[PDB]
Amino acid sequence: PKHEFSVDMTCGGCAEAVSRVLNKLGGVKYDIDLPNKKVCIESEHSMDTLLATLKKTGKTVSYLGLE
Ligand SMILES: [Pt+2]
């Protein structure tokens, strides 16, 4: 599935932090829209796992649904 999340990223370091947690999880194809504070993730990970992984950045995260 393709999941979209709102992630409260402020700058390049925030976008990097998101990338780092997703890279460590593995099994994800993602793209990060820093200006609009959004992250789209295609994977067979559960929405739950993806939410928890994004939250490891410490940024506020919410779920914008399936794409
Ligand atoms: Pt930042």
UniProtKB/Swiss-Prot annotation:
Effect of R20E: Has no overall effect on Cu(+)-bridged heterodimer formation with ATP7A
Outcome recorded upon mutating V21A: Has no overall effect on Cu(+)-bridged heterodimer formation with ATP7A
Nucleus as UniProt keyword: no
UniProt key word Secreted: no
GO MF term set: ATPase binding; copper chaperone activity; copper ion binding; copper-dependent protein binding; cuprous ion binding; metallochaperone activity
Phosphoserine carried by residues: S46
Residues with PTM N6-acetyllysine: K59
Tissue: Ubiquitous.
Superkingdom of origin organism: Eukaryota
GO BP terms, alphabetized: copper ion export; copper ion transport; intracellular copper ion homeostasis; negative regulation of apoptotic process; response to oxidative stress
InterPro entries referenced in this protein's UniProt entry, alphabetically: Copper_transport_ATOX1-like (IPR051881), Heavy-metal-associated_CS (IPR017969), HMA_dom (IPR006121), HMA_dom_sf (IPR036163)
Family matches, as PROSITE patterns: HMA_1, HMA_2
Occurrences of domain HMA (ranges): 1-62
Binding-site positions, Cu cation: C11, C14
Keywords: Acetylation, Chaperone, Copper, Copper transport, Ion transport, Metal-binding, Phosphoprotein, Transport
CDD domains: HMA
Gene Ontology cellular component list: cytosol
Assembly information from the UniProt record: Homodimer. Interacts with ATP7B. Interacts with ATP7A. Interacts (via dimer form) with SLC31A1 (via C-terminal domain); this interaction improves ATOX1 stability and controls intracellular Cu(I) levels.
Function summary: Binds and deliver cytosolic copper to the copper ATPase proteins. May be important in cellular antioxidant defense.
Family: Belongs to the ATX1 family.
Domain notes: The heavy-metal-associated domain (HMA) coordinates a Cu(+) ion via the cysteine residues within the CXXC motif. The transfer of Cu(+) ion from ATOX1 to ATP7A involves the formation of a three-coordinate Cu(+)-bridged heterodimer where the metal is shared between the two metal binding sites of ATOX1 and ATP7A. The Cu(+) ion appears to switch between two coordination modes, forming two links with one protein and one with the other. Cisplatin, a chemotherapeutic drug, can bind the CXXC motif and hinder the release of Cu(+) ion.
This protein's name: Copper transport protein ATOX1
Organism annotation: Homo sapiens
